[PDB]
Amino acid sequence: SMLDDAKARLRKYDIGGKYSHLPYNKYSVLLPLVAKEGKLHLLFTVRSEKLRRAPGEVCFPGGKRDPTDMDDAATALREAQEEVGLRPHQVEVVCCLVPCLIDTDTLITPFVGLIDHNFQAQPNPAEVKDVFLVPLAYFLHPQVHDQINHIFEYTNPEDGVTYQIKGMTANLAVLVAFIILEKKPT
Template identity: 50%
Template sequence: MSRPVPPQEPVRNSLIDDAKVCLRKHDVGSKYSHLSYNKCSVLLPLLAKGGKLHLLLTLRSEKKYTLVTPVVGFINHNFKAQPNPDEVKRVFLVPLDYFLHPRVYRQNRFTFSGHSLIAHFFEYMNPEDGVTYQIKGMTARLAVLVALIILEKKPTFEVEYNLNDLISSSKEFFLKFLKHNTSKL
């Protein structure tokens, strides 16, 4: 006897399937694995909830690395985080479209090694607990990039990427800082 499919299941599966198609178009695979620089990966866990994709974030300390590889993963909508309180203060969800159309956002322009940069700062009030979170730094940069790739919409603010050629412009952006950080001159 087959089990009835909950009405939200097809919507959830469609959201995830559509996101995977968009991500595959921008996947660079192991193209940069041969580089011998300090490397790390950042997991960007997405889950479908209430007919929208959400990014699962943690309130933690940010570390600076030379080469960051964003890895997008999908988690079950029933996932319940059980963080180690010594490492993670809070876990919260932010709708992915918030990183293109935020309610509270500011940016700072600055110059680093001759390159003009935009630092994104998001404030998100979690409706579940009423706490306001600040999302900035590499987390904000990667959240914007994933939202641009998956949602394929223009943000309400300026970004450094060419929206008509996202893969090339994002690659160029991240590699120019890799070159600067490894230069001995």
């Protein structure tokens, strides 16, 4: 099936806990895959203008590991619950992708999660200004604007609202699209 095929592809790229004990400042992100209208989508947040890190930016759900977290996947799931109301029973963590090194002392670990079809986001306005889906296939043929660095513009056909996706967030979205969608019969 579509979902079984996605998880099987993703598992081939799982690094697991190989980099997880290294002594960095540690953050995790959740890359949430949602099946709608017979296609896979990624779920994105727009961060509230209030925040420390990256006010008003498009980001995946995530944040800093705390002492309660059993592991880096727990961090991603805790933060996703706080931001959008995603509960544990509503997500299956499929794999851990290549981590992202930043600022010489920080390591951000991304986890891909399959999201239950009955989940409905409840944006927490202290954390997130907006939540939106993008079809995964978009990232194979994005609308690119050079700002010199590349920026994706996605317009939601439901309402005509345009979002800018950039940086680590854009990079990870492309990676997931390649992993899941490359070399598929029509």
